[PDB]
Design a protein around this nucleic acid. Sequence first.
RNA 1: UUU
Length: 161
Amino acid sequence: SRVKQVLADIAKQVDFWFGDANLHKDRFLREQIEKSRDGYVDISLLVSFNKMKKLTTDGKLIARALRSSAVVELDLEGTRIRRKKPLGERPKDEDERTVYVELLPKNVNHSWIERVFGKCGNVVYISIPHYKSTGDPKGFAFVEFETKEQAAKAIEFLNNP
RNA sequence: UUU
C-alpha cells in the first residue's frame, strides 16, 4: 500500500533524527530535548521540519508510525517523543567509520549517495557540507557507516572503477 | 535544516 510505505518512511526518518549518529551531530534538536530535561519533544516540532513536511502534516499519523520502533517512545497521548534509550558519550571511533568522498555535480543529494554506498554497508549518516554566507556545495560528502569493516569496504570502492 |  502507498500508506504502508508513507508510514514506514515516517518511522525511518524519526528512528533517524533521534538515532545515535544524528543526535551526536545536530545541536538544534539536542537543544530541544535537554531544554525540557524530562526528555520528550512535541510531534508539533517534527511537523515543522522540511523532510517531515514532504510526508505528512498530520501528527496522529506520525504517532501511528512510531508504535513499532526500537528507539523513540510516546507516553500518555501520542503528542511527544522521547529517545527510549539514553544518549551518552560521543563515539571516538566515528572518524574511522566516516569516509571522505569527492562528488559529481549538482550536490547529487542524499538519494544518490545512499544508492551507490548502500552496496557496501548500512549508511548511518551522510554529510553534504554547504558554505555558510553563500549556500554553495563544497563539492564533497562525508559518509558514516556502522562498523569500521563497512567503512573500508567503501575506501575499497575508492580504488575500484 | 536530513535541524
